[model samples]
Target chain A: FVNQHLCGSHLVEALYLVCGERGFFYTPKT
Target chain B: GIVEQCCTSICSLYQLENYCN
Candidate 1:
């Protein structure tokens, strides 16, 4: 019973941002 | 939503450049 809109605009974009780093980061997990 | 960074990241010297208009 935990359904909710995650407002993924920022969270989703966040992934791409880290991806664009092209290995500048070991993992996108902060 | 009427903006875009053109746009993403900043290998430049601006701190926290990822967050911008």
Candidate 2:
């Protein structure tokens, strides 16, 4: 199951800024 | 609907199908 809970709108936008046009695969470091 | 559109754009940009869920 894809973890939709992990990715929020703010986070997505932040990642867009951090990673530029091509965003990255978000893997929680456990 | 806006959030969904945002997610869709993010998903396409990142190729993250998981985020779309």
Candidate 3:
């Protein structure tokens, strides 16, 4: 279940970010 | 959805062909 969400399956990311956290994860999408 | 073979999660070839073919 770790890499599952870490993959490019539109699971972890929101409406903006891609599979592997597109924007600033530690900060936030600006 | 591709991995290192690709980048973006948005696949360009894995067409979502519900049940056409």
**Candidate number achieving the greatest DockQ relative to the actual structure:** 1
Worst 10 residues of 1 chain A by lDDT: A1-10
* Model 1 lDDT per residue over B1-21, tens place: 101222232233232234332
At residue A24, candidate 2 shows an lDDT of: 54
Could you tell me which 10 consecutive residues in candidate 3 chain A have the lowest summed lDDT?
A: A21-30
Compose the digit string of candidate 3's lDDT tens values, residues A1-30.
Answer: 455436534422332343223332221122
Stretches of candidate 2 exceeding 4 Å from the true structure: A1-7, A27-30, B1-21
How far in Å is the alpha carbon of A3 misplaced in model 2? 15
Ranking by TM-score: 2, 1, 3
Q: List model 2 lDDT by residue over B1-21, tens digit each.
A: 424444446545454333333
Tens digits of lDDT, candidate 1, A1-30: 111123234433554465454422222222
Q: In model 1, what lDDT does residue A1 have?
A: 12
Candidate 1: C-alpha lDDT: 0.32
lDDT of 2 by residue, A7-28 (tens): 5546556555656555555444
- Report fnat, model 2: 0.00
Clashing pairs in 2: none
TM-score of 3: 0.19
